[PDB]
């Protein structure tokens, strides 16, 4: 059975895990899963996400509690504590253009070896990237990003674990669901099979390993 | 007033039915100045086409925000989507216009707008994808930083993109980057051609067509 | 002013156009657009699609009337006349692994310069592909496919041109919508704005240029 | 009967809760022999998870077919989707099993199943993606082509993939490709080891525990 108690997080997320965590500045983020990680000081984490939200919310709470060794994100500007720890050298930060982050994660999810993007060409992002010329235009070769566990948020799941999302809470969640080895979805409601139409489901239950509340 | 002057003039550049992305801050003021006969559609990076204004008190939805996590509304016919689809609209050339803020723009039309070394390190977010992919990039920015020209010969701050932006709008000037360099097309009614040039370190080509406006 | 009469195909689909056409063996294919093309004998087409359907249906009718110079497809085995024309040399056929076709069309749609895929490595599909190794593994660099017009099929459009699809009629249609310069959608029903929820729309009206029926 | 013999034995390989893709033709018969206690989920390349059997007359839907365009049903909890998402499931490792037909399999476990030069050119469809990507590939094919062995030392027909398949099931034998070569694990109750060897051109390692079955 996919649905498990939230208290089981300390058994599924290990010290030093590489995690994808959904959410856009805390919107569509698994707030209850993050609270469990803080409850049990699961530390030395590498967190892949759009951002580190704010000091008081979402992924920001993990940084507040110094549980991350590394973040791979497109933005940190709204979290002064992420900047503090970056400057001190305690937290490694890999900044990634948001559209490249989406496609690098997706590439792992759909089994690609990489994608070429014009974004970042001729900027500091080009550093340590292979450049490939196609039709005289230059592209950066950007590589798939993998993770041990995806921690995602969704609006509802049906009995079979099919997920739907709600408005701008979707953002990175369905992409991370395809990219990680183990997928744990925090959802707001469990609904009967047949409540979520085949035309509307966005993540099929087959790829969701665990569901909390 | 200068931010108003810019936003009003940028708003005149928009055409009916365009998909438009406004960056956080100065460019978001543009929305307040759209002519009543111009219907546009706004896109936000976090995954919406059809963004509307902040909701009246009590009509907030926790799952519906702009790219700064502030509550927004969604207009009839909106579509929400994941971040891959979002940057497919942006990078794939489906975004008609983006209006972004600016730290420097140079004679090549190159924009620096995401980092100031040794001071602000916020990361780039979607800015690199937007500048690279928008059909048209409009930079909306004050002409100088406490007197220092921001329109320079070659950016010294980190580039957002090597793409040539299409229009610069300051409280003093409207400038169109071209194959020959920067073309000064308009100046504020409240300034002079000499003041503009004095406050621009970059070489400006002055148009035969020169207009007053913003 | 997106909704136009079917006769407007002749202003929009030029002789010698490169076209993406939706449909999986004729399911979710714009049958009425195809009939109008045949009516005005618009020829020398290059058609990018999953297949050439069957001789009496969908894209297969284009081939029967010899309106195609080239097809870029994953499958032609249900259409003996496509095979016959291939052998005689009158029709150029480029066979693309179905998943590679999906990602090459998508690459064009989302602004990528190419994608790396393990599919086809060490087969004839490797011929005239750059090979790229990433962490020891080999991938084929597969390149974006572009087209002048996407001729897609959808179940419903609202007044603003937002689309939804129905079951296995979706297949390549929403991908092609993003990839071509001009997009023409054949729809079964026009519905009021507000009938299609923000959470269920799959193709936004902004990228749909014209609608028929 | 030989096709039933293969389909029954393949069906015994399926495990509860697996996502399974059955190729058109012989592999599709596998769906008729799943044990009552095994619930699996079927995926089709045209874009569905949760495929069900052909509908009773009058219950067809024009938009709901299999990868041969024959009418199917969808089961409760099915999801339909676009072709990029379909091959993301396949190429990205989310499909537990694919059962595919076969023209040849060789000592390296390489399958040739999409083209016979000069005689049959239908194209590869999804076959190369499925062989490259499925967590487990099972080939289901008659042992010979009117006497010619289809299990050969090195394929002479064009390869579908350089991926090593995990299992071969014919009406005479069950063979597991391994790093040492082809391991014969089982033989049909209706054949003999001497017949299997006479009809297999490839080298076969013989298991200590050779079983009768299919
Ligand atoms: Cl309101
Ligand atoms: Cl003057
Ligand atoms: Cl039925
Ligand atoms: Mg268009
Ligand atoms: Mg013997
Ligand atoms: Mg022998």
Numbering used by the authors:
A (entry chain D), C (entry chain A): 1 to 213
B (entry chain C), D (entry chain B): 2 to 215
The article reads:
CtfAB then transfers the CoA from acetoacetyl-CoA to acetate to reform an acetyl-CoA and produce acetoacetate. CtfAB is a member of family 1 CoA transferases. CtfB contains the acetyl-CoA binding site and the PS01724 signature sequence which includes the catalytic glutamate residue (E46) sandwiched between two short antiparallel beta strands on the N-terminal end of an eight-stranded mixed beta sheet. CtfA contains the acetate binding site and the PS01723 signature sequence.
